[PDB]
Amino acid sequence: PKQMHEDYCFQCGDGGELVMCDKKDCPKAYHLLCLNLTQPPYGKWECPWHQCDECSSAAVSFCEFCPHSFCKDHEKGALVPSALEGRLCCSEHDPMAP
Ligand SMILES: [Zn+2]
Ligand SMILES: [Zn+2]
Ligand SMILES: [Zn+2]
Ligand SMILES: [Zn+2]
């Protein structure tokens, strides 16, 4: 069946209870504990993928494996292609085995 979000946590890869990103066309979902969330957020909740991890500005480049992402100023040397279909990965993954 079709559903708009992934069935697994984008932080740790495991399923169960997730909070789903309310940002337009974001399929990402996360365990509460995986983001230090203490309770299911109410209202419009956008996930960390959309904010640059270095500063606070909006992300324009994205790690395809975890929610690290980077604004204009911090794209350079942040993402490289990985061995998995060339998908870009942040410095937190081995690019040979992301
Ligand atoms: Zn998780
Ligand atoms: Zn999101
Ligand atoms: Zn930034
Ligand atoms: Zn990453």
Swiss-Prot record:
A zinc finger (PHD-type) spans 6-53. Signal peptide: none annotated. Interacts with BRD4. Interacts (via KIKL motif) with BRD3 (via NET domain). Histone methyltransferase. Preferentially dimethylates 'Lys-4' and 'Lys-27' of histone H3 forming H3K4me2 and H3K27me2. H3 'Lys-4' methylation represents a specific tag for epigenetic transcriptional activation, while 'Lys-27' is a mark for transcriptional repression. Belongs to the class V-like SAM-binding methyltransferase superfamily. Histone-lysine methyltransferase family. SET2 subfamily. It is linked to Defects in NSD3 may be involved in non small cell lung carcinomas (NSCLC). Amplified or overexpressed in NSCLC. A chromosomal aberration involving NSD3 is found in childhood acute myeloid leukemia. Translocation t(8;11)(p11.2;p15) with NUP98. This is Histone-lysine N-methyltransferase NSD3. The chain holds residues 1316 to 1413 of 1437 of the full protein.
